Every structure is written in structure tokens, then in C-alpha cells.
Amino acid sequence: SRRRVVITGMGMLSPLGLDVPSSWEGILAGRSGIAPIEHMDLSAYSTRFGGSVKGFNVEEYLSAKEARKLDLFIQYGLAASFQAVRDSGLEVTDANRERIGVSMGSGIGGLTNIENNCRSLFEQGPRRISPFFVPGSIINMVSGFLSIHLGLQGPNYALTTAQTTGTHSIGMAARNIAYGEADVMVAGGSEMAACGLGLGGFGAARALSTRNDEPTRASRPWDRDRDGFVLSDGSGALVLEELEHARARGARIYAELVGFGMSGDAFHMTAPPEDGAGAARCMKNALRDAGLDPRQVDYINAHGTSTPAGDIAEIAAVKSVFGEHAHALSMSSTKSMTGHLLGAAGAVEAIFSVLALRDQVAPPTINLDNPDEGCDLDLVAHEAKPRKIDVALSNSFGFGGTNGTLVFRRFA
Amino acid sequence: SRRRVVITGMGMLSPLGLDVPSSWEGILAGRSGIAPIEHMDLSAYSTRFGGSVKGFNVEEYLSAKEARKLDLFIQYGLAASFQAVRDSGLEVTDANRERIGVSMGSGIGGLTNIENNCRSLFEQGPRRISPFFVPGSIINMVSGFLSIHLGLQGPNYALTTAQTTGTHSIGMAARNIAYGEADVMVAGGSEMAACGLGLGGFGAARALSTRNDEPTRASRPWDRDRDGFVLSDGSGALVLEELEHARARGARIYAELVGFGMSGDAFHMTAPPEDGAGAARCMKNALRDAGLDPRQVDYINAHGTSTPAGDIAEIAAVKSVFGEHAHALSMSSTKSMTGHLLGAAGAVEAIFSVLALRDQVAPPTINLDNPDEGCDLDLVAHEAKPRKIDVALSNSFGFGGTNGTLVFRRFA
Ligand SMILES: NC(=O)C1CCN(CCc2ccccc2)CC1
């Protein structure tokens, strides 16, 4: 048998806001976080816009000296994690610290730091590389620094599954709790790939929208005029907690995490199969894990990247899984507003899925002006849709054909 | 309820050989894989040697056309994975492809490729960044490319827990199988961090041995004249398989994986605590997971990095976990010969632990001329020791205070 897992704390940096409530207010208002990138010369570049975190103050969390040791993606992960642990009210003690762990991941990790240290290395040789280069750049240092700061002695690890990172991180943390390896996990992801290497790297693969004239219309999932994803920065963290542990301390419980699915497409390094076969197996795995019939799903937070092939595969996968229920559920891409946070996408989208349950509202797919061929589902075009939501899925489908699905349910 | 997990295939690249048997021959002969680095000019660096893979032929696995797109850590992880799958005799079918997954990790991932593309960017502009920059560099693409080449549709993910990565990857892949998420997993790690930023960044932290004039003696775990770790490259992969699934197909079983432990030190970003308290918590977790009396432990493949603080903390943790039995077991560091393969360390050392069980021999700790204060256990100094081994333990410790332990035992 298996223990139940609930969400008792959430934390976020996104292009819409420096916490969950500010971000969620923007999501329900259909506001875009996408703008031309600043203090960084994107002249030789075909994409000059994205989703930046605006006005982040790391000294609310860390001393300036400790912050100087850490890449932005680690700072962002620690901010979301500290927010989530505060939001949970949990008190870490000698009696429970071995039962509290961390799984915060990243898809690309410390590109800004690597870039800045390449500058030193090429211009002056190795003796100018920062002594903190390695520990301040490696993906597991959000989990590492958080564990050291809060005294967490539970399972300590980090996933890196590209654009699926946040989803897998939360799912595998839920497994730790369900199977009794921890009572509490801080789980999610962070990303800051807006450097020459990130915009250049995706740009060289012609993966990005080049809609420089209208950055806020660039992210348009399922719209016939879409032309690739929008690169975005930030972090999401959830406090996952065993149910009896949450009830014993009088925790506020947002939602229950009832299902986790994983699959591999085994198809292509970057492109999904046209029919979304692996995304369909992953959703069916998640529903089987939750003991739920596809008919019980009310809301899907899509991967919805605004790539031609990705968006159409997800429609095919939902029609395949849900059959005569596929039009009854609501499915929206919050990437229409946030852009694509890569490894943090799944983390912030799990939070939006939990808030859809709390507030009984499907967030919009903004910019869905002209649905493409076959995109005839309820994709919540333009404006938020109050409706009944008992069961909410969050999907992530990333490079290497790696898929994740989380199933959340209302808790009462 | 929890299923049993066996090892049916292994694969490797190490500084000692281009497969498992060649690597193991070097281990049992006390041979060093450490030499001055040839693939780049290190005259400006404080460390100029390491454990390189010698004579690797990517072409016996992949087309040279596909290899050109992939960082060496990915090529290395694929090589070990292909070897392990072949060694298992498993045939991928429509009947089983959804039940076979992959978890191959890395501590740093594609630092060579990122460095080379950063050089292109700075010297020539963003239009010279490779279109394959992202999928040829990011850590999850061993799991991704392996799934594409072999048709594996099961759980597809990757860990990144610094020097613990290979141990965590194997342990968590075993849990997938134990809990019914998969019947087979290919799991381990790969690393090729021998680039300017790698040698420069560990050099900046003064973490590396600077014994440039005698590289084969640099790696000297528990020796009083040790002065840091030796950076090494390669990969280890194991095929983990549910017991009844292995028995059902007449698989050759090398050993059973009975125990997995994780803990966080919550102490320091890079330094282990001198008393080895997190390591001790991790080993106790693993021994309890395996249902063992600690006196059953015959052999420990130590982390044994050849750092002053790390090596002594391991002695303290083993004495704390095993009490008087600490004097009866044998403990060695094969990093004495291979150097430190970082995220691959736990993967090649899991293989060495399984081969210790197969051959009933404790591999030597070479270079242990003068054991330091309190380093008075059986550390198998200089020469391989034939002995009874029913139970073998492999430990890993990493940045962020992240600990892993695997417990293997003979299968009858
Ligand atoms: N000692 C050597 O040089 C060995 C190294 C391993 N090779 C490759 C074997 C292989 C190829 C494809 C798939 C699985 C395995 C054979 C030669």
C-alpha cells in the first residue's frame, strides 16, 4: 500500500511576478510576462525577447556574499524553495529533519556562470576562474544549499530532464513520501538560460519564436501563426507532505497529488511523434497511478510550448486518451503568458494546476486568435473560465522524448 | 509490494579500459589509469594530468555523423549503456518496451561542448553556435538517445547529484523496479569534465592533486601525503531487472541489489563533516533497507577521493556504523587507480562491487604507503585481497552534502 501526498506550501519566481499570488493574478487576468531582454546585447540574434524575472532581490533570501557564489538559476530555486517552506508553516526540528528532503532540478543549469567564467578563461587563463565556479554552477546546489540552510537531512537529489524537470522532480518527490522514504519533500525546478548560449543555442536550432515586433503575441499555443517557443526564467517549488503528517500539525492543504506518470517516446531528440503516442501513454500511466478514469479529468495544464509539432501532438494525445470526454475537459497553456521556463515549466505549471483547483477556474490560452487544423478542443481561448474542477493534470514533454504527467485532486 | 532487483548486465569506459573486463583486469593488477592529459595544453594550469579514456572508438556504437552532435559525456554514457544491454542478453520487443526505462546521469554534463560553443560565441558571434548545442550538451540526453536507439519507452530520466550521481541513479532505478514502475532499467552515469573550465574550476578550489611530476601516485586515498582528488572520465551502466523477470528469461544474474540509502549532511556546500555523520546516516539507512546485520558487510568500495577531509570522514563513518566489525570487513578505494569519475564514480564502483562479489576479491587501494592518523582499518593496501564477500557496499558523497549507499549481495 501507499501513503497519500498533499501540497501544503508553494513558492515561485516567474515572468508574471516575484511570488505565487502575484503570478496567479497575472495568469487569471491573461497578462503576458514577455518583453525584450535588457542589460544584454541581443543584436546579432534573431530572438531579442523572452520571459525575464523583473526586480528579483536575492538579499531577501541570502547575504550579498553568499549570493555572489551562486548562479541565477540557483538563486531562483532557493527563492521559490524558501517561499514554499515559509508558506507551509512547517517547523524543522531534530525530531523530523531526517524525514524532510529536497528535489529541486534544472534543465540547463548554470549557463550564465559558465558564460562569465569562459570570458575569464579565454581572456586571462584558468587562474581567474572563481573558486566557487563548480559548486555555484552545478544543478544539485539548489537541493544542497536549501538542505544546508534549513538543516534538511532527508533524501537530497536533483533531476535534470530538460523541459520535463519540474514535473519529474515533483512526481519522484511524491513517490519518496508515498513509499515512506520521507514525510516532507521540497520539489520543483528553476532555470535562467537567457544568455548568449541559451538564446544562441535554441536560436541556432530555429526553435524560438522570432516575433520581435510583438513579443507579447509571440507565445500562441495551437494558433495557426505560432512559430516556436518563448524562452523564460524563474522557479517553482512545492512542499509535498504525507497527509497524516499535514493533519497532525493543522497544515493548510491546497490539493492532493494522486497520480504521477512517466514515459519515453523513444522517437526523436527534440521533436515529438505527430500523434503524441508517448504523451498519451504517460497520461494513461498517471491516471492508472491515481485509480482514475479519463472521464474524471476536468482541467489539463498543457505543455503547450507554441511549437508547430509539439502543440498538435498534445491535441492528438488528449483525443486518444479521453475519447468522448476530450471536449468536456478544459485544456490551456499558461506558456501563452509565461513563456517556456524549461526545467521550471513543470514546477510553475503544477502550482497553476493546484490554484485552478483552489479557485475553480481554468486559466486562459491567450493569443489563440485562429485555432489550427484539428485544434477544436476547449483550449480556454483568450479569457479565464470559471468551471467545476475536481481533477487537474499537468503535462511536460521534453527533449529526448521524456514525458511526465502529474494528477492533482481537490482535497476536503 | 516491493519486488527484488538483480544485476543482469554491466558496461563501462574507464581510464583502465574500454569495457568492463579490461577495466577489472587493471583493477585487480593494481594498475593506474592516470597520466598527463594529451587532448589539450594545460601548461597554465596547476594540475596537468587525470584519468582519460584511451582509444575510445565511438564508431562501434554510433555513426560518426550522429557522434559529431554529441558531447563526449553522452558518447561515453551511450557506450556503457550499449555494452550493458548487450551483456544482459535482453531483447526489446513490443511486449516489453514500455517496461524498460533508463536513468543515466552526470554531475557536470557537456562542459566541453558548452566551452567550445562559448568560444565560438565570443570570438565569432552567435551564428557559429551549433544547432545541436542544446540536445548535444544537456544531461538527460544519454537517457534520451539510448531510448531512441533501443526503443525503450519506460521511465526516462536523469539525476545530477555531483559526485553521488551514479550511486543515486542506480538506487532510484532499483526503486522504480521494486515498486512496479518498470521491470528493467539501464542505470548509471557518465562524465567528461576534462576541459579548461573543469580542470580550471576544480583547480581554482584547490580541490585537485598537483602531483604533476608523478601522476600515477597522485591518487592516494588515506595516505598521509594526499593532496586532493584526480579528475577522471568515463561511464558505468548496469541493467537492473526484476528478479522473476530475470528468472523467467533465464538471465545470468551477477548479484542482487538489496539496499539503497540516501542522506543529506546539511553541513557545507563542498566540505564533508570530519565525523562522517551524514555518511553514517546514509549507510545505516541502506543496511536497514537491506534487512542486514552490519556484521554481514564483507567489502566496502569507499568513495575514497584522496582529499584530506573526505577520506578521514569515511573512516569515522565506517567505525561509527560497524563498531568492532569495522576491523573485520575490507574497505578499498578504486579511485587509487581510476581517479574520480565524478558523476560516473558511483556507476563504475557499483560494477567493481558486483565484480568483487563475482570473483571473491577485494580490489586494492594502491599508493597507501603511509596510512594517516586513525586510518587503521583493513584498506587493502597495495595488492588485491582474495576473501569471502557475501555483502558489498558502495558509498558516494558529493557537493551539497549529498550521500548515497548501495548494498549488493551474492545471488543463489
Ligand atoms: N576492448 C575493446 O576495445 C572493446 C570495447 C567494447 N567494444 C564495443 C562492443 C559493443 C558495441 C556495440 C554494442 C555493445 C557493445 C568491443 C571492443
mmCIF file of C-alpha atoms in Angstrom, chain A residues 94-407:
data_model
loop_
_atom_site.group_PDB
_atom_site.id
_atom_site.type_symbol
_atom_site.label_atom_id
_atom_site.label_comp_id
_atom_site.label_asym_id
_atom_site.label_seq_id
_atom_site.Cartn_x
_atom_site.Cartn_y
_atom_site.Cartn_z
ATOM 1 C CA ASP A 94 15.821 17.475 15.499
ATOM 2 C CA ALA A 95 12.791 15.114 15.699
ATOM 3 C CA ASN A 96 11.845 15.431 11.967
ATOM 4 C CA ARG A 97 14.875 16.792 9.995
ATOM 5 C CA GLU A 98 15.882 13.240 8.770
ATOM 6 C CA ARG A 99 12.338 12.955 7.258
ATOM 7 C CA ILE A 100 12.468 16.239 5.236
ATOM 8 C CA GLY A 101 14.270 16.244 1.873
ATOM 9 C CA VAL A 102 14.669 18.233 -1.353
ATOM 10 C CA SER A 103 14.454 17.533 -5.110
ATOM 11 C CA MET A 104 14.854 20.828 -6.971
ATOM 12 C CA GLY A 105 16.104 20.443 -10.552
ATOM 13 C CA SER A 106 17.102 22.379 -13.669
ATOM 14 C CA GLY A 107 17.032 21.571 -17.412
ATOM 15 C CA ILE A 108 20.156 23.515 -18.476
ATOM 16 C CA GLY A 109 21.642 24.760 -15.156
ATOM 17 C CA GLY A 110 24.431 27.328 -14.811
ATOM 18 C CA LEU A 111 24.808 28.787 -18.392
ATOM 19 C CA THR A 112 25.229 32.450 -17.205
ATOM 20 C CA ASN A 113 28.040 31.425 -14.779
ATOM 21 C CA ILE A 114 29.682 29.187 -17.454
ATOM 22 C CA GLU A 115 29.498 32.104 -19.934
ATOM 23 C CA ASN A 116 31.001 34.619 -17.432
ATOM 24 C CA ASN A 117 33.803 32.124 -16.497
ATOM 25 C CA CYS A 118 34.549 31.338 -20.219
ATOM 26 C CA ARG A 119 35.180 35.105 -20.559
ATOM 27 C CA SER A 120 37.789 34.972 -17.666
ATOM 28 C CA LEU A 121 39.374 31.719 -19.049
ATOM 29 C CA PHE A 122 39.804 32.776 -22.736
ATOM 30 C CA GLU A 123 40.996 36.349 -21.927
ATOM 31 C CA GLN A 124 43.284 35.667 -18.868
ATOM 32 C CA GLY A 125 43.692 31.820 -18.483
ATOM 33 C CA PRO A 126 42.386 29.488 -15.728
ATOM 34 C CA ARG A 127 43.831 31.340 -12.679
ATOM 35 C CA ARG A 128 40.947 33.906 -12.868
ATOM 36 C CA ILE A 129 38.194 31.196 -12.683
ATOM 37 C CA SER A 130 36.110 31.638 -9.468
ATOM 38 C CA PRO A 131 36.911 29.109 -6.678
ATOM 39 C CA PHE A 132 33.081 28.779 -6.363
ATOM 40 C CA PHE A 133 32.641 28.107 -10.118
ATOM 41 C CA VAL A 134 31.822 24.372 -9.728
ATOM 42 C CA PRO A 135 29.599 24.326 -6.586
ATOM 43 C CA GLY A 136 27.940 27.647 -7.655
ATOM 44 C CA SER A 137 27.075 26.250 -11.148
ATOM 45 C CA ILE A 138 26.016 22.574 -10.689
ATOM 46 C CA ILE A 139 22.307 21.693 -10.749
ATOM 47 C CA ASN A 140 22.137 19.854 -7.400
ATOM 48 C CA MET A 141 23.166 23.022 -5.443
ATOM 49 C CA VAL A 142 19.559 24.257 -5.008
ATOM 50 C CA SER A 143 18.868 20.990 -3.101
ATOM 51 C CA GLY A 144 22.365 21.284 -1.491
ATOM 52 C CA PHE A 145 22.104 24.928 -0.351
ATOM 53 C CA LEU A 146 18.476 24.542 0.783
ATOM 54 C CA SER A 147 19.338 21.408 2.856
ATOM 55 C CA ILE A 148 22.328 23.233 4.465
ATOM 56 C CA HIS A 149 20.313 26.430 5.215
ATOM 57 C CA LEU A 150 17.213 24.683 6.715
ATOM 58 C CA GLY A 151 19.018 21.626 8.197
ATOM 59 C CA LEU A 152 17.210 19.102 5.939
ATOM 60 C CA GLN A 153 18.761 15.589 6.257
ATOM 61 C CA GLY A 154 16.169 13.632 4.183
ATOM 62 C CA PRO A 155 16.672 12.418 0.582
ATOM 63 C CA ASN A 156 18.681 15.122 -1.255
ATOM 64 C CA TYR A 157 18.848 14.980 -5.065
ATOM 65 C CA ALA A 158 18.184 16.801 -8.303
ATOM 66 C CA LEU A 159 16.568 15.731 -11.587
ATOM 67 C CA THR A 160 17.586 17.132 -14.986
ATOM 68 C CA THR A 161 15.081 16.049 -17.701
ATOM 69 C CA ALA A 162 15.203 19.162 -19.879
ATOM 70 C CA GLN A 163 11.682 20.687 -20.221
ATOM 71 C CA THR A 164 10.190 17.850 -18.046
ATOM 72 C CA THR A 165 12.416 18.565 -14.984
ATOM 73 C CA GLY A 166 9.844 20.299 -12.764
ATOM 74 C CA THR A 167 7.163 17.632 -13.385
ATOM 75 C CA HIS A 168 9.524 14.674 -12.743
ATOM 76 C CA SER A 169 11.015 16.422 -9.660
ATOM 77 C CA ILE A 170 7.545 16.781 -8.050
ATOM 78 C CA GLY A 171 6.417 13.264 -9.094
ATOM 79 C CA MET A 172 9.516 11.448 -7.763
ATOM 80 C CA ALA A 173 9.381 13.539 -4.504
ATOM 81 C CA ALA A 174 5.703 12.388 -4.132
ATOM 82 C CA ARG A 175 6.940 8.792 -4.567
ATOM 83 C CA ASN A 176 9.554 9.308 -1.772
ATOM 84 C CA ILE A 177 6.684 10.276 0.593
ATOM 85 C CA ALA A 178 4.149 7.690 -0.651
ATOM 86 C CA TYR A 179 6.620 4.795 -0.130
ATOM 87 C CA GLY A 180 7.771 6.129 3.310
ATOM 88 C CA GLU A 181 11.350 7.329 2.434
ATOM 89 C CA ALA A 182 10.381 10.871 3.629
ATOM 90 C CA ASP A 183 7.425 12.676 5.275
ATOM 91 C CA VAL A 184 8.123 16.067 3.569
ATOM 92 C CA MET A 185 9.860 16.990 0.294
ATOM 93 C CA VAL A 186 10.578 20.412 -1.269
ATOM 94 C CA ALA A 187 10.275 19.767 -5.020
ATOM 95 C CA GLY A 188 10.280 21.729 -8.251
ATOM 96 C CA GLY A 189 12.745 23.378 -10.582
ATOM 97 C CA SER A 190 14.480 26.570 -11.671
ATOM 98 C CA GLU A 191 16.038 27.956 -14.835
ATOM 99 C CA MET A 192 17.910 31.036 -16.146
ATOM 100 C CA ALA A 193 19.082 30.206 -19.707
ATOM 101 C CA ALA A 194 18.688 33.840 -21.055
ATOM 102 C CA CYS A 195 22.334 34.262 -22.038
ATOM 103 C CA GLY A 196 24.033 34.291 -25.433
ATOM 104 C CA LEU A 197 24.387 30.489 -25.150
ATOM 105 C CA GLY A 198 20.657 29.869 -24.346
ATOM 106 C CA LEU A 199 19.186 32.363 -26.883
ATOM 107 C CA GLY A 200 22.024 31.471 -29.339
ATOM 108 C CA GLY A 201 21.695 27.684 -28.763
ATOM 109 C CA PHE A 202 17.891 27.487 -29.209
ATOM 110 C CA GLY A 203 18.181 30.190 -31.949
ATOM 111 C CA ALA A 204 20.697 28.036 -33.938
ATOM 112 C CA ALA A 205 18.110 25.180 -33.866
ATOM 113 C CA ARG A 206 15.479 27.774 -35.088
ATOM 114 C CA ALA A 207 13.354 26.580 -32.117
ATOM 115 C CA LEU A 208 12.372 30.103 -30.868
ATOM 116 C CA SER A 209 9.625 32.499 -31.994
ATOM 117 C CA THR A 210 11.275 35.446 -33.881
ATOM 118 C CA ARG A 211 8.171 37.714 -33.429
ATOM 119 C CA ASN A 212 10.427 40.611 -32.166
ATOM 120 C CA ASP A 213 7.866 43.310 -33.226
ATOM 121 C CA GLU A 214 5.147 41.932 -30.836
ATOM 122 C CA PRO A 215 6.806 39.885 -28.031
ATOM 123 C CA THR A 216 3.531 39.540 -26.020
ATOM 124 C CA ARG A 217 1.815 37.838 -29.050
ATOM 125 C CA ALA A 218 4.836 35.520 -29.715
ATOM 126 C CA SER A 219 3.639 32.647 -27.398
ATOM 127 C CA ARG A 220 0.406 31.475 -29.100
ATOM 128 C CA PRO A 221 -0.088 27.716 -28.470
ATOM 129 C CA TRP A 222 -2.413 25.971 -31.044
ATOM 130 C CA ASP A 223 -2.689 29.277 -33.082
ATOM 131 C CA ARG A 224 -2.064 28.762 -36.831
ATOM 132 C CA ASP A 225 0.509 31.675 -36.808
ATOM 133 C CA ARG A 226 2.732 30.176 -33.997
ATOM 134 C CA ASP A 227 6.483 29.962 -34.852
ATOM 135 C CA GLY A 228 8.234 28.329 -31.834
ATOM 136 C CA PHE A 229 8.575 28.728 -28.057
ATOM 137 C CA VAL A 230 9.464 31.783 -25.965
ATOM 138 C CA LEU A 231 12.415 31.371 -23.562
ATOM 139 C CA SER A 232 11.546 32.267 -19.926
ATOM 140 C CA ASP A 233 13.267 32.348 -16.484
ATOM 141 C CA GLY A 234 12.112 31.514 -12.979
ATOM 142 C CA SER A 235 11.376 28.795 -10.472
ATOM 143 C CA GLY A 236 8.626 26.838 -8.756
ATOM 144 C CA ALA A 237 8.724 24.912 -5.504
ATOM 145 C CA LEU A 238 6.101 22.908 -3.692
ATOM 146 C CA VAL A 239 6.094 21.488 -0.202
ATOM 147 C CA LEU A 240 4.805 17.910 -0.556
ATOM 148 C CA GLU A 241 3.729 16.308 2.723
ATOM 149 C CA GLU A 242 2.319 12.969 3.903
ATOM 150 C CA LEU A 243 -1.398 13.552 4.708
ATOM 151 C CA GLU A 244 -1.435 12.348 8.357
ATOM 152 C CA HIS A 245 1.752 14.464 8.966
ATOM 153 C CA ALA A 246 -0.049 17.545 7.464
ATOM 154 C CA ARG A 247 -3.274 16.932 9.537
ATOM 155 C CA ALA A 248 -1.346 16.348 12.833
ATOM 156 C CA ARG A 249 0.163 19.907 12.689
ATOM 157 C CA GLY A 250 -3.020 21.608 11.254
ATOM 158 C CA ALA A 251 -1.409 22.384 7.877
ATOM 159 C CA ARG A 252 -3.371 24.309 5.252
ATOM 160 C CA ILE A 253 -3.719 21.770 2.390
ATOM 161 C CA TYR A 254 -4.075 23.192 -1.144
ATOM 162 C CA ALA A 255 -4.722 19.921 -3.056
ATOM 163 C CA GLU A 256 -3.808 16.233 -3.099
ATOM 164 C CA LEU A 257 -1.237 14.798 -5.542
ATOM 165 C CA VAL A 258 -2.919 11.475 -6.560
ATOM 166 C CA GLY A 259 -1.067 10.451 -9.791
ATOM 167 C CA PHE A 260 2.363 10.532 -11.480
ATOM 168 C CA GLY A 261 3.126 9.181 -14.927
ATOM 169 C CA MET A 262 6.372 8.914 -16.888
ATOM 170 C CA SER A 263 7.078 7.606 -20.363
ATOM 171 C CA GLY A 264 9.672 7.780 -23.114
ATOM 172 C CA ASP A 265 8.611 8.478 -26.735
ATOM 173 C CA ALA A 266 11.799 6.715 -27.995
ATOM 174 C CA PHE A 267 11.126 8.770 -31.202
ATOM 175 C CA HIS A 268 13.406 11.852 -31.756
ATOM 176 C CA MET A 269 15.961 14.011 -29.871
ATOM 177 C CA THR A 270 13.807 17.221 -29.929
ATOM 178 C CA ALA A 271 10.504 16.577 -31.897
ATOM 179 C CA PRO A 272 7.525 14.602 -30.514
ATOM 180 C CA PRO A 273 5.742 11.980 -32.659
ATOM 181 C CA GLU A 274 2.892 13.601 -34.692
ATOM 182 C CA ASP A 275 0.216 11.518 -32.851
ATOM 183 C CA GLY A 276 1.621 12.220 -29.310
ATOM 184 C CA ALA A 277 1.795 8.438 -28.660
ATOM 185 C CA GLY A 278 4.271 8.793 -25.734
ATOM 186 C CA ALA A 279 2.320 11.757 -24.177
ATOM 187 C CA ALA A 280 -0.822 9.546 -24.408
ATOM 188 C CA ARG A 281 0.932 6.571 -22.608
ATOM 189 C CA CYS A 282 2.259 8.995 -19.967
ATOM 190 C CA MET A 283 -1.223 10.469 -19.237
ATOM 191 C CA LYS A 284 -2.759 6.904 -19.138
ATOM 192 C CA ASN A 285 0.065 5.871 -16.725
ATOM 193 C CA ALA A 286 -0.680 8.913 -14.486
ATOM 194 C CA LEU A 287 -4.454 8.172 -14.470
ATOM 195 C CA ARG A 288 -3.831 4.440 -13.720
ATOM 196 C CA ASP A 289 -1.477 5.538 -10.894
ATOM 197 C CA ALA A 290 -4.337 7.737 -9.477
ATOM 198 C CA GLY A 291 -7.000 4.949 -9.952
ATOM 199 C CA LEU A 292 -8.952 7.484 -12.070
ATOM 200 C CA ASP A 293 -10.944 7.019 -15.314
ATOM 201 C CA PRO A 294 -10.021 9.561 -18.074
ATOM 202 C CA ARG A 295 -13.655 10.748 -17.726
ATOM 203 C CA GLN A 296 -12.888 12.191 -14.223
ATOM 204 C CA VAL A 297 -10.348 14.779 -15.599
ATOM 205 C CA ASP A 298 -11.727 18.335 -15.605
ATOM 206 C CA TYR A 299 -8.641 20.503 -16.340
ATOM 207 C CA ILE A 300 -5.325 19.980 -18.171
ATOM 208 C CA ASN A 301 -2.421 22.380 -17.925
ATOM 209 C CA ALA A 302 -0.835 21.505 -21.300
ATOM 210 C CA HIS A 303 2.865 21.552 -22.100
ATOM 211 C CA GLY A 304 1.620 23.891 -24.915
ATOM 212 C CA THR A 305 5.060 25.314 -25.960
ATOM 213 C CA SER A 306 3.818 27.175 -29.180
ATOM 214 C CA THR A 307 5.931 24.836 -31.414
ATOM 215 C CA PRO A 308 4.089 23.649 -34.559
ATOM 216 C CA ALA A 309 4.645 19.875 -33.970
ATOM 217 C CA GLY A 310 4.507 19.915 -30.103
ATOM 218 C CA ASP A 311 1.076 21.649 -29.830
ATOM 219 C CA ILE A 312 -0.580 19.331 -32.436
ATOM 220 C CA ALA A 313 0.848 16.120 -30.800
ATOM 221 C CA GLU A 314 -0.743 17.167 -27.443
ATOM 222 C CA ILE A 315 -4.170 17.611 -29.129
ATOM 223 C CA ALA A 316 -3.766 14.118 -30.711
ATOM 224 C CA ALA A 317 -2.664 12.637 -27.350
ATOM 225 C CA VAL A 318 -5.672 14.184 -25.405
ATOM 226 C CA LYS A 319 -8.208 12.995 -28.087
ATOM 227 C CA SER A 320 -6.613 9.482 -27.880
ATOM 228 C CA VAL A 321 -6.676 9.290 -24.039
ATOM 229 C CA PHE A 322 -10.047 10.983 -23.359
ATOM 230 C CA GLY A 323 -12.224 9.918 -26.357
ATOM 231 C CA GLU A 324 -15.838 11.266 -25.926
ATOM 232 C CA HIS A 325 -14.659 13.294 -22.818
ATOM 233 C CA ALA A 326 -11.850 15.174 -24.722
ATOM 234 C CA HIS A 327 -14.155 18.244 -25.409
ATOM 235 C CA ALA A 328 -15.705 18.293 -21.872
ATOM 236 C CA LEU A 329 -12.411 18.935 -20.044
ATOM 237 C CA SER A 330 -10.692 22.320 -20.398
ATOM 238 C CA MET A 331 -7.038 22.408 -21.535
ATOM 239 C CA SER A 332 -4.947 25.601 -21.510
ATOM 240 C CA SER A 333 -1.283 26.558 -21.990
ATOM 241 C CA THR A 334 -0.190 29.104 -19.364
ATOM 242 C CA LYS A 335 3.020 29.353 -21.544
ATOM 243 C CA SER A 336 0.807 31.705 -23.656
ATOM 244 C CA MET A 337 1.523 34.224 -20.814
ATOM 245 C CA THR A 338 4.681 32.970 -19.001
ATOM 246 C CA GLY A 339 6.625 31.613 -21.964
ATOM 247 C CA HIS A 340 8.584 28.385 -21.531
ATOM 248 C CA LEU A 341 10.568 28.156 -18.222
ATOM 249 C CA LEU A 342 12.214 24.876 -19.474
ATOM 250 C CA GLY A 343 13.171 22.903 -16.308
ATOM 251 C CA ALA A 344 10.952 25.191 -14.151
ATOM 252 C CA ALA A 345 7.934 24.951 -16.555
ATOM 253 C CA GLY A 346 6.529 21.838 -14.819
ATOM 254 C CA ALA A 347 7.048 23.365 -11.363
ATOM 255 C CA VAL A 348 5.196 26.672 -12.020
ATOM 256 C CA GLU A 349 2.518 24.766 -14.043
ATOM 257 C CA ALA A 350 1.903 22.301 -11.132
ATOM 258 C CA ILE A 351 1.336 25.405 -8.938
ATOM 259 C CA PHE A 352 -1.102 26.872 -11.524
ATOM 260 C CA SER A 353 -2.886 23.438 -11.656
ATOM 261 C CA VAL A 354 -3.213 23.437 -7.834
ATOM 262 C CA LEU A 355 -4.608 27.024 -7.921
ATOM 263 C CA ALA A 356 -7.070 26.041 -10.711
ATOM 264 C CA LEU A 357 -8.436 23.527 -8.142
ATOM 265 C CA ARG A 358 -8.473 26.060 -5.270
ATOM 266 C CA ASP A 359 -10.207 28.836 -7.293
ATOM 267 C CA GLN A 360 -12.330 26.582 -9.614
ATOM 268 C CA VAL A 361 -11.082 28.397 -12.743
ATOM 269 C CA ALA A 362 -9.295 27.295 -15.923
ATOM 270 C CA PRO A 363 -6.552 29.780 -16.846
ATOM 271 C CA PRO A 364 -6.655 31.066 -20.453
ATOM 272 C CA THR A 365 -4.599 30.267 -23.523
ATOM 273 C CA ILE A 366 -4.003 33.892 -24.623
ATOM 274 C CA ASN A 367 -3.198 34.721 -28.302
ATOM 275 C CA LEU A 368 -5.397 31.762 -29.536
ATOM 276 C CA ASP A 369 -6.814 34.022 -32.303
ATOM 277 C CA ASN A 370 -7.111 31.310 -35.034
ATOM 278 C CA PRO A 371 -7.009 27.707 -33.755
ATOM 279 C CA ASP A 372 -5.072 25.491 -36.207
ATOM 280 C CA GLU A 373 -6.431 22.433 -38.120
ATOM 281 C CA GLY A 374 -7.712 19.872 -35.551
ATOM 282 C CA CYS A 375 -7.248 22.252 -32.538
ATOM 283 C CA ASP A 376 -11.030 22.188 -31.786
ATOM 284 C CA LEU A 377 -10.853 21.254 -28.022
ATOM 285 C CA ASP A 378 -11.893 23.642 -25.201
ATOM 286 C CA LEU A 379 -8.471 25.419 -25.089
ATOM 287 C CA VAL A 380 -9.893 28.306 -22.977
ATOM 288 C CA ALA A 381 -9.017 30.910 -25.677
ATOM 289 C CA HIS A 382 -8.349 34.496 -24.503
ATOM 290 C CA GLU A 383 -10.039 34.613 -21.022
ATOM 291 C CA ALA A 384 -10.130 32.567 -17.767
ATOM 292 C CA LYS A 385 -13.146 30.180 -17.428
ATOM 293 C CA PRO A 386 -14.730 29.545 -14.017
ATOM 294 C CA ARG A 387 -15.909 25.908 -14.027
ATOM 295 C CA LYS A 388 -16.027 22.755 -11.869
ATOM 296 C CA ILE A 389 -12.509 21.259 -11.409
ATOM 297 C CA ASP A 390 -12.171 18.174 -9.212
ATOM 298 C CA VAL A 391 -9.175 16.638 -11.105
ATOM 299 C CA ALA A 392 -6.365 18.659 -12.831
ATOM 300 C CA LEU A 393 -3.474 17.146 -14.896
ATOM 301 C CA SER A 394 -0.193 18.944 -15.615
ATOM 302 C CA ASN A 395 1.828 17.696 -18.637
ATOM 303 C CA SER A 396 5.504 18.145 -19.630
ATOM 304 C CA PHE A 397 7.020 16.646 -22.839
ATOM 305 C CA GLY A 398 10.774 17.456 -23.315
ATOM 306 C CA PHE A 399 13.923 16.787 -25.319
ATOM 307 C CA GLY A 400 14.888 13.111 -25.541
ATOM 308 C CA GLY A 401 11.132 12.277 -25.727
ATOM 309 C CA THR A 402 10.898 12.310 -21.905
ATOM 310 C CA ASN A 403 7.302 12.775 -20.654
ATOM 311 C CA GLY A 404 5.786 13.497 -17.264
ATOM 312 C CA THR A 405 2.221 13.924 -16.027
ATOM 313 C CA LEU A 406 1.026 14.957 -12.550
ATOM 314 C CA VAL A 407 -2.589 14.361 -11.368
#
